[PDB]
């Protein structure tokens, strides 16, 4: 451990008894001390780094060329001394011209090339046995990548080993200084200290895996921050699988970051141009898969965390445990995205050549002809003609009928764009009577599909190593011709999505240290289990991957999940459904029947300038492009409305104010038995109650429809009077006390209490606290309705609506 550092001091004690970055400069100072003695320099360091600590130092070293000799399996000694020409070289040039010869992966050598490198390592000119007698520049120091350990004890005791250490914490801040443009700098120091103490505390207890927690994750969180402290915790502790360890990690997050890691509830907003969940959108643009698995709403807490990982072009790792649903996560994600999922089950002890004869090309030609005809008939839906017979033939060696295909390719500009691939491949296919000579990911890395290395726990370390060479893009193949790599940089829409399981061995620490680990588990929420196992029941909730169906689905659900009442009901119901769903509910035209009146009155005045506050209020904070979600928008700024601004919450209560106002106003138009007597005595005698009601209800409808009405927590105090006028129209002798109560809620701006001042002074010209009873009854019943709707929003029992009304229930 680090106590060896202390013991180094103890070592230094026995020494004393005998008597570009910062830490990177210390390691480079060690390598400079190493070069003072003529031997091979080995990098005896922990993994994750690579030879960058020597790939960079040559630039600061006296013009020393970087012979990065990537010593591998297929590497003969004749590929390291050469010169064998019939008369009638990188390691060779490095033996000729002096250079830094970076020998990568000595442990992966063939053990005579190992003997050749053992021969070459002499201080004096080499006199090789194995090919030629000797191959004598006289400073050609050769550095050695002592890879993840293997090496022979003679080759690994003739060299010199340099211990490459890790990164220091203030030095990690120095490395973070290249990212601290869009970073609160103290929050940057908090993220760095959080990852450091997280690994230092996780490496001392029960929590299972190796639990790497490296600096690449710190820089990943920092560069995740710059695209707007919650998302950092979400995708840096969704990857703790055991829930008890997740609780302990949240406790450590409170210990360091000093907050409460209440889970931001996510929600499935699935519109046409975008499907989005919880601080993550997706470019849902041309759709290939046409799948058969449903939305799986309980997986919504992690389906987002890979969707963000699908957008940040990070390495997708749907890691975790078996049969919990992992192929369906990536299936549904790139199914809604349409990103052409295609999978390779790399656990069959497959090889690196497996990732990177006439009739095979003929069948591939028929399939690609069908694909291009499909994309053709997508846009310009005009074609038919044996072209449809050409299509039927396309989905149908004795392949002479393919020549008939080219005849159909024989007989416009869209036809020109199709025949660009088609006539070219078919004119090549004219050679289907000629001489033959007979990749996996290199198909998808050059096309635009999304690749799924499924079940990929146990294939090989080195296969995933050659994958991780492409993880960080340019790909170096070997199926090219002579001397050129030709890396394919078409990575746009090409995502390495790797499943795993815990049954076999875990993914190796390199690919763990260079990816976005994302566990999964089992929850089975209510509508989730209703829709997943729905083959007996009548309905799912989100029953498609097409939004015009999902709208009528959820609108058929929550307008059927509804089971002085209907106020908070109609308010929350017309508060949780989407605006597109609001238009749809109007289009689809007990309490749901009366909601059509609320629909007409809402399209009159749901959010006239309340939407202007929401737009301007919504606009200052980072916000979406359109109007898809509302209560999820209310739930979505869950840290922001935890900033006490309440820009989104006050709109929610204002909606309740408008609906309750409409109820009170229709009741007052009905006012247009003792109250019946006073309202009649508009036309017992000498009324005082009727004006005392009608003017205050006019004050209500005034408070409904107006700029400061938008600018009006105080809306709760007005709603207290709304419940009060309700409770007096129910509580319609006691006129003096009831008037004193109305005067208290006035004692709780000019006009909205001025009308109470007029009606009260008129009633006093004529002239218990149970308002808290039905008031707290309304608070509690709306809290119940808030939970019953936040079910159909996400499925966990908490909300910004819920925490707000809970703190209101403190009063």
Ligand X SMILES: Nc1ncnc2c1ncn2[C@@H]1O[C@H](COP(=O)(O)OP(=O)(O)NP(=O)(O)O)[C@@H](O)[C@H]1O
Site string for ligand X, 329-358 (x = CB under 6 A): ---x--------------------------
Residue 300 dihedral angles phi and psi, to the nearest 5°: -60, -25
Q: Is 327 in the site for ligand X (CB under 6 A)?
A: yes
**Is there binding between residue 384 and another protein (CB under 8 A)?**
no
- Pick one of ligand X, another protein, none as the site partner of residue 552 (Cβ within 5 to 8 A by kind): another protein
C-beta closer to ligand X: residue 332 or 585: 332
From the list another protein, ligand X, none, pick the one residue 499 interacts with, judged by a Cβ distance below 5 to 8 Å according to partner type: ligand X
Phi-psi region of 328 (alpha: psi -120 to 50; beta: other; left: phi over 0): alpha
Interface with another protein includes 76 (CB under 8 A)? yes
Is 334 annotated among the ligand-binding residues? no
Q: How far is Cα 522 from Cα 529, in angstroms, rounded to an integer?
A: 11
Cβ closer to ligand X: 453 or 648?
A: 453
For residue 771, the surrounding DSSP H or E stretch is helix 771-793
**All residues at 6 or more sequence positions from 203 whose CB lies less than 8 Å from its CB, including other chains:** 211
For 363, 427, 497, 557, the CA distances from 658, given in Å and listed in that order, are 65, 71, 49, 25
296 interacts with, out of ligand X, another protein, none, CB within 5 to 8 A per kind: ligand X
345 binds another protein (CB under 8 A): yes
3-state secondary structure of 43: strand
Q: Does 287 bind another protein (CB under 8 A)?
A: yes
> Which of another protein, ligand X, none interacts with 633 (beta carbon under 5 to 8 A by kind)?
none
Is residue 57 packed enough to be buried (19+ CB in 10 Å), middle (13-18) or exposed (0-12)?
buried
Residues 786, 799: contact at Cβ < 8 Å?
Answer: yes
CB of 328 to ligand X, least distance (A): 4
- In the complex, what is the shortest distance from the CB of residue 458 to another protein, in angstroms, rounded to a whole number? 8
The Cα 446–Cα 480 span in angstroms is 14
Whether the CB-CB separation of 545 and 271 falls below 8 Å is answered with no
Phi, psi of 498 (to 5 degrees): -110, 115
Q: Does residue 526 have a known ligand-binding role?
A: no
- Binding segment for ligand X (CB under 6 A), chosen from 12-20, 317-325, 618-626, 800-808, is 317-325
Q: Does an H or E element contain 496, and which? A: strand 496-499
Does the annotation list 48 as a binding residue? yes
Q: Is 397 annotated as ligand-binding?
A: no
Q: Strand order in 516-517's β-sheet?
A: 341-345, 450-454, 496-499, 316-318, 516-517
The reply on whether position 479 binds another protein by CB under 8 A is: no
The total of other beta-carbon atoms located within 10 Å of residue 14's CB is 10
Q: Is residue 118 a contact point for ligand X (CB under 6 A)?
A: no
DSSP classification of residue 483? S
Give the nearer residue to ligand X in terms of CB position, either 248 or 342: 342
Instruction: Write each residue from 530 to 559 as x if it is in contact with another protein (CB under 8 A), else as -, in one continuous string.
Output: ----xxxxxxx--xxxxxxx--xx--x---
Quote the least distance from Cβ 372 to another protein, whole Å.
12
Q: Which of 71, 156, 270, 296 binds ligand X (CB under 6 A)?
A: 296
- 87 part of the interface to ligand X, by CB under 6 A: no
CA distance 541 to 184: 41
Site string for another protein, 555-594 (x = CB under 8 A): -x--------------------------------------
Q: Which helix (DSSP H) or strand (DSSP E) does residue 404 occupy? A: helix 401-410
Task: Pick left, alpha or beta for residue 610 (phi over 0 → left; psi -120 to 50 → alpha; otherwise beta).
Answer: alpha
Contact partner at residue 532 from ligand X, another protein, none, CB < 5 to 8 Å by partner kind? ligand X
* Long-range contacts, 198-201 (Cβ 8 Å, 24+): 198/249, 198/252, 198/256, 201/252
Tell me the binding residues. 45-52, 320-327
Given the rule CB under 6 A, which residues bind ligand X?
293-294, 296, 299, 322-328, 332, 455, 499, 501, 532
Given the rule CB under 8 A, which residues bind another protein?
74, 76, 78, 84-88, 131, 272-273, 284-288, 290, 292, 322-323, 336, 338, 345, 347-349, 353, 357, 359-360, 363-364, 370, 373-374, 377-378, 388, 391-392, 395, 437-438, 455, 534-540, 543-549, 552-553, 556
């Amino acid at each position: 451990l680090a106590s060896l550092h202390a013991e180094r001091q103890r070592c230094f004690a026995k020494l004393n008894e005998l008597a570009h970055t910062d830490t990177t400069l210390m390691n480079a100072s060690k390598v400079l001390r190493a070069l003072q003695v003529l031997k091979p320099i080995l990098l005896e360091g922990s993994p994750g780094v690579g030879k960058t600590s020597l790939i960079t130092a040559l630039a600061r070293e006296t013009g020393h060329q970087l012979v990065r000799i990537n010593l591998s399996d297929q590497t003969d000694l004749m590929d390291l001394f050469g010169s064998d020409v019939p008369v009638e070289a990188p390691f060779l040039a490095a033996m000729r011209n002096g250079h830094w010869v970076l020998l990568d992966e000595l442990n992966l050598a063939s053990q005579s090339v190992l003997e050749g490198l053992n021969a070459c390592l002499d201080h004096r000119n080499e006199a090789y046995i194995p090919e030629l007698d000797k191959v004598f520049h006289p400073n050609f120091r050769v550095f050695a990548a002592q890879n993840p350990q293997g090496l022979p004890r003679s080759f690994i005791n003739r060299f010199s080993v340099v211990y490459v250490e890790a990164l220091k914490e203030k030095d990690m801040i120095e490395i973070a200084a290249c990212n601290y443009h869009q970073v609160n700098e103290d929050w940057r120091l908090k993220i760095i200290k959080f990852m450091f103490r997280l690994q230092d505390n996780i490496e001392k207890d029960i929590s299972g895996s190796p639990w790497e927690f490296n600096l690449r994750d710190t820089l990943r969180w920092l560069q995740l921050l710059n695209d707007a402290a919650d998302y950092l915790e979400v995708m840096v502790l969704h990857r703790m699988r055991t829930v008890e360890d997740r609780v302990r990690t949240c406790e450590l997050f409170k210990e360091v970051f000093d907050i409460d890691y209440e889970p931001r509830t996510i929600g499935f907003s699935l519109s046409s141009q975008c499907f989005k969940v919880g601080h993550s959108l997706l470019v849902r643009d041309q759709k290939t898969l046409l799948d058969s698995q449903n939305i799986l709403q309980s997986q919504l807490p992690v389906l987002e965390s890979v969707i963000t990982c699908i957008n940040k072009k990070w390495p997708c790792i749907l890691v975790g445990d078996t049969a919990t649903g992992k192929t369906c996560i990536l299936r549904l994600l790139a199914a809604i995205a349409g990103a052409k999922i295609k999978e390779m089950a790399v656990n069959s002890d497959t090889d690196t050549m497996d990732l990177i004869d006439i009739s095979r090309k003929a069948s591939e030609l028929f399939t690609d002809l069908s694909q291009q005809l499909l994309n053709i008939v997508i846009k310009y839906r005009n074609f038919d003609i044996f072209r449809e017979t050409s299509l039927y033939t396309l989905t149908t060696s004795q392949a002479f009928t393919l020549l008939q295909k080219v005849v159909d390719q024989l007989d416009e500009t869209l036809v020109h764009s199709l025949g660009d691939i088609h006539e070219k491949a078919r004119k090549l296919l004219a050679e289907f009577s000629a001489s033959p000579a007979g990749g996996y990911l290199l198909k998808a890395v050059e096309e635009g599909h999304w690749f799924v290395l499924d079940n990929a726990n146990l294939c090989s370390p080195a296969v995933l190593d050659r994958l991780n060479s492409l993880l960080e893009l340019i790909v170096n193949e070997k199926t090219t011709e002579d001397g050129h790599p030709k890396t394919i940089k078409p990575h746009p829409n090409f995502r390495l999505f790797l499943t795993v399981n815990p049954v076999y061995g875990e993914l190796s620490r390199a690919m763990r240290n260079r990816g976005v680990e994302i566990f999964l588990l089992k929850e089975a929420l209510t509508e989730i289990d209703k829709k997943q196992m729905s083959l007996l029941e009548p309905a799912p909730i989100s029953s498609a991957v097409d939004t015009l169906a999902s709208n009528i689905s959820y609108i058929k659900y929550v307008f059927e999940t509804m089971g002085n009442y209907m106020y908070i009901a109609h308010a929350i119901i017309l508060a949780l459904f989407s605006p597109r769903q609001l238009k749809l509910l109007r289009k689809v035209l007990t309490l749901k029947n009366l909601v059509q009146k609320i629909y007409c009155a809402d399209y009159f005045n749901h959010m006239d300038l309340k939407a202007s506050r929401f737009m301007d209020i919504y606009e200052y904070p980072v916000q979406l492009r359109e109007v898809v979600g509302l209560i999820q928008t209310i739930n979505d700024f869950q840290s922001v409305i935890l900033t006490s601004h309440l820009e989104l919450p006050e709109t929610y209560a204002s909606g309740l104010l408008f609906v309750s106002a409409h109820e009170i106003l229709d009741l007052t138009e009905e006012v247009n038995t003792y109250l019946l007597k006073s309202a009649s005595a508009v036309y017992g005698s000498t009324p005082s109650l009727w004006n005392l009601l009608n003017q205050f209800s006019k004050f209500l409808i005034e408070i409904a429809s107006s700029n400061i009405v938008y600018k009006l927590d105080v809306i709760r105090h007005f709603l207290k009077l709304v419940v009060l006028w309700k409770n007096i129209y129910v509580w319609t002798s006691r006129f003096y006390c009831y008037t004193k109560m109305l005067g208290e809620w006035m004692f709780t701006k000019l006009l909205e209490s001025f009308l109470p001042k007029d009606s009260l002074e008129k009633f006093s010209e004529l002239q218990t606290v149970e308002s808290l009873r039905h008031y707290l009854e309304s608070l509690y019943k709306e809290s119940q309705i808030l939970e019953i709707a936040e079910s159909l929003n996400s499925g966990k029992v908490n909300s910004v609506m819920r925490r707000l009304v809970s703190t209101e229930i403190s009063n």
